[PDB]
Design a protein around this ligand. Sequence first.
Ligand SMILES: *[C@@H]1O[C@H](CO)[C@@H](O[C@@H]2O[C@H](CO)[C@@H](O[C@@H]3O[C@H](CO[C@H]4O[C@H](CO[C@H]5O[C@H](CO)[C@@H](O)[C@H](O)[C@@H]5O)[C@@H](O[C@H]5O[C@H](CO)[C@@H](O)[C@H](O)[C@@H]5O)[C@H](O)[C@@H]4O)[C@@H](O[C@H]4O[C@H](CO)[C@@H](O)[C@H](O)[C@@H]4O)[C@H](O)[C@@H]3O)[C@H](O)[C@H]2NC(C)=O)[C@H](O)[C@H]1NC(C)=O
Ligand SMILES: *[C@@H]1O[C@H](CO)[C@@H](O[C@@H]2O[C@H](CO)[C@@H](O[C@@H]3O[C@H](CO[C@H]4O[C@H](CO[C@H]5O[C@H](CO)[C@@H](O)[C@H](O)[C@@H]5O)[C@@H](O[C@H]5O[C@H](CO)[C@@H](O)[C@H](O)[C@@H]5O)[C@H](O)[C@@H]4O)[C@@H](O[C@H]4O[C@H](CO)[C@@H](O)[C@H](O)[C@@H]4O)[C@H](O)[C@@H]3O)[C@H](O)[C@H]2NC(C)=O)[C@H](O)[C@H]1NC(C)=O
Lengths: 37, 37
Amino acid sequence: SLFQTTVELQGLIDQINSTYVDLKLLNRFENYIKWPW
Amino acid sequence: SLFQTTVELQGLIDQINSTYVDLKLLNRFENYIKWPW
Ligand SMILES: *[C@@H]1O[C@H](CO)[C@@H](O[C@@H]2O[C@H](CO)[C@@H](O[C@@H]3O[C@H](CO[C@H]4O[C@H](CO[C@H]5O[C@H](CO)[C@@H](O)[C@H](O)[C@@H]5O)[C@@H](O[C@H]5O[C@H](CO)[C@@H](O)[C@H](O)[C@@H]5O)[C@H](O)[C@@H]4O)[C@@H](O[C@H]4O[C@H](CO)[C@@H](O)[C@H](O)[C@@H]4O)[C@H](O)[C@@H]3O)[C@H](O)[C@H]2NC(C)=O)[C@H](O)[C@H]1NC(C)=O
Ligand SMILES: *[C@@H]1O[C@H](CO)[C@@H](O[C@@H]2O[C@H](CO)[C@@H](O[C@@H]3O[C@H](CO[C@H]4O[C@H](CO[C@H]5O[C@H](CO)[C@@H](O)[C@H](O)[C@@H]5O)[C@@H](O[C@H]5O[C@H](CO)[C@@H](O)[C@H](O)[C@@H]5O)[C@H](O)[C@@H]4O)[C@@H](O[C@H]4O[C@H](CO)[C@@H](O)[C@H](O)[C@@H]4O)[C@H](O)[C@@H]3O)[C@H](O)[C@H]2NC(C)=O)[C@H](O)[C@H]1NC(C)=O
């Protein structure tokens, strides 16, 4: 039971890590390029 | 073991929740200020 819980938690951590990386990358990309495009 | 798992989960939640606050602050700031520079 503890192993299954930890595996699910690790999958969730990986997903959240990837999604925050993507969101921060999108924010930096929108800051990098000019506005009126 | 359960205390360690709960501590890891709480540490994850704190980072998630602070990241959500940080993202929403930037979103609100960008909503307040008009797009043109
Ligand atoms: C979940 O999200 C997390 C984001 O919050 C993410 O963690 C971060 O991921 C980044 C990549 O996506 C990591 O960036 C890497 O940085 C490498 C450079 O590391 C050098 O510095 C280390 C220590 O520096 C720290 O402290 C200084 C201040 O002194 C600070 O400015 C830095 O930002 C760091 O915080 C060195 O580690 C050594 O020292 C520590 C103790 O401080 C020891 O514990 C270590 O064992 C070790 O002895 C390290 O050796 C490096 O010198 C990038 O490496 C580039 O540069 C080196 C030369 O420095 C080249 O040789 C490489 O080829 C490469 O070009 C690397 O590419 C990457 O950019 C970031 O470090 C992560 N942060 C933490 C805290 O871990 C998680 O990864 C993510 N989860 C998953 C699963 O992905
Ligand atoms: C870190 O993350 C945190 C969670 O992600 C976050 O906290 C969240 O903040 C939100 C607001 O920013 C909160 O949403 C509000 O919810 C109000 C409703 O609250 C009522 O229920 C409370 C109890 O909730 C429990 O039960 C529900 C199911 O009903 C469950 O979903 C919850 O998870 C809880 O288990 C009541 O609190 C009472 O009981 C607790 C103990 O359980 C006591 O400690 C309290 O002191 C209190 O006695 C509360 O009183 C409410 O009854 C929304 O209120 C609407 O509805 C009420 C009627 O119910 C109206 O009167 C209001 O006018 C309004 O219309 C409110 O609008 C908002 O949506 C969210 O609940 C928080 N989550 C948690 C877990 O607390 C943190 O903000 C975040 N950190 C930072 C820095 O942001």
